Design a protein around this ligand. Structure first.
Ligand SMILES: O=C(CN1CCNCC1)Nc1ccc(F)cc1
Ligand SMILES: O=C(CN1CCNCC1)Nc1ccc(F)cc1
Ligand SMILES: [Ca+2]
Ligand SMILES: [Ca+2]
Lengths: 203, 203
């Protein structure tokens, strides 16, 4: 009776782990496809399942970080969203913090995404007319790119050509390339593989 | 490319269906065990997964109704909770409405649970001092039990002996017997069975 309850609780942790991987894969696919409402609904599901988990393996922490990272990137232009206990941290600064915390390879693509998030964190403040906020984001994040960015902030050059070369769309595209690699690695997770074989068996 | 997206969406509907059954089983077990915080967290998970589903089979509608029914019973003494668009409907009246909508057998246990919910819907108003509300709940729900209940409402007999014979604990116990039958039927669902075999394989 007591041992049965322990085995049931362990089984629930196994199923919750399978649910986390499934929801990360669906969140990644919605992000890549630009399906905004599916991403919103899947994010709600992922967040609730994460609250029902305690012990996490390193792989599960990485999966959670990826979900949190995409959530902040999707809300990158929503300067009213508070993703950290410190209310000053903007969504792209919060995305930057998680990006440098994921246990992943630091290849050329990693650094390009990192630098694009840094540039856009300032650019999204300038585009809203939040000039003093852009300076504060600059001080929290940060030679050649650094001095060009400070010059842009002081000149209030909102639509500066520098932000066209290193644009929001460019950041999204590079992030989507990374998302494609994550979708390839987790396409073999238990829940998706089982559902896939069921769909194929009915075709 | 377009056909692959259709097959992926179908696979997500299969996995979401498996998730619904799993969460109903975990919600039922938390209710039976009196694990309040696990029930709250599992309910949040079930509600989010239900928002990501469109087409429902009759079996899925029944599963959803059971989750909604237990949610209202758990909140039966929370007269500040609005479970319906009509703000006058109390949680036990809302539980009563779903109970008469489930496609299930109307055995002796069904009618006993139905009558206990009716009695307690009035009793929970009386215990809070909401005498006029109890009369209004009476008029919405409703000869021998009916006249005894109207006499109790007019006399303001909050702790009347009638409510001791047909008590809240009695309603919970009869509901838990039904929950035991639901746990037996869905213990064989795909996700729980797969997680169970994994846990057993490691023992
Ligand atoms: O963003 C958070 C909240 N959490 C992040 C770290 N600091 C504030 C607390 N969780 C989340 C999980 C999974 C998602 F898909 C989305 C959000
Ligand atoms: O209670 C509702 C809300 N819903 C019920 C019908 N009228 C108001 C809209 N959903 C729910 C689903 C699953 C749960 F586990 C808990 C609640
Ligand atoms: Ca703000
Ligand atoms: Ca009320």
């Amino acid at each position: 009776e007591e041992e049965d309850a322990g085995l049931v609780a362990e089984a629930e942790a196994v199923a919750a782990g399978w649910m986390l991987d499934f929801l990360c894969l669906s969140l990644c696919r919605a992000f890549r496809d630009g399906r905004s409402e599916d991403f919103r609904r899947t994010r709600n599901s992922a967040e609730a399942i994460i609250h029902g988990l305690s012990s996490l393996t390193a792989c599960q922490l990485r999966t959670i970080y990826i979900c949190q990272f995409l959530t902040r990137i999707a809300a990158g232009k929503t300067l009213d969203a508070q993703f950290e206990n410190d209310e000053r941290i903007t969504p792209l600064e919060s995305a930057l913090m998680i990006w440098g915390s994921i246990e992943k390879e630091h290849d050329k693509l990693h650094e390009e995404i990192q630098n694009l998030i840094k540039i856009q964190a300032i650019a999204v403040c300038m585009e809203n007319g939040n000039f003093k906020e852009a300076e504060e984001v600059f001080e929290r994040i940060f030679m050649p790119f650094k001095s060009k960015l400070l010059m842009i902030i002081s000149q209030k050059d909102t639509f500066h050509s520098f932000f066209q070369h290193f644009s929001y769309n460019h950041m999204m595209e590079k992030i989507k390339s990374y998302v494609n690699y994550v979708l390839s690695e987790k396409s073999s997770t238990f829940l998706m593989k089982a559902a896939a074989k069921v769909v194929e068996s009915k075709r």
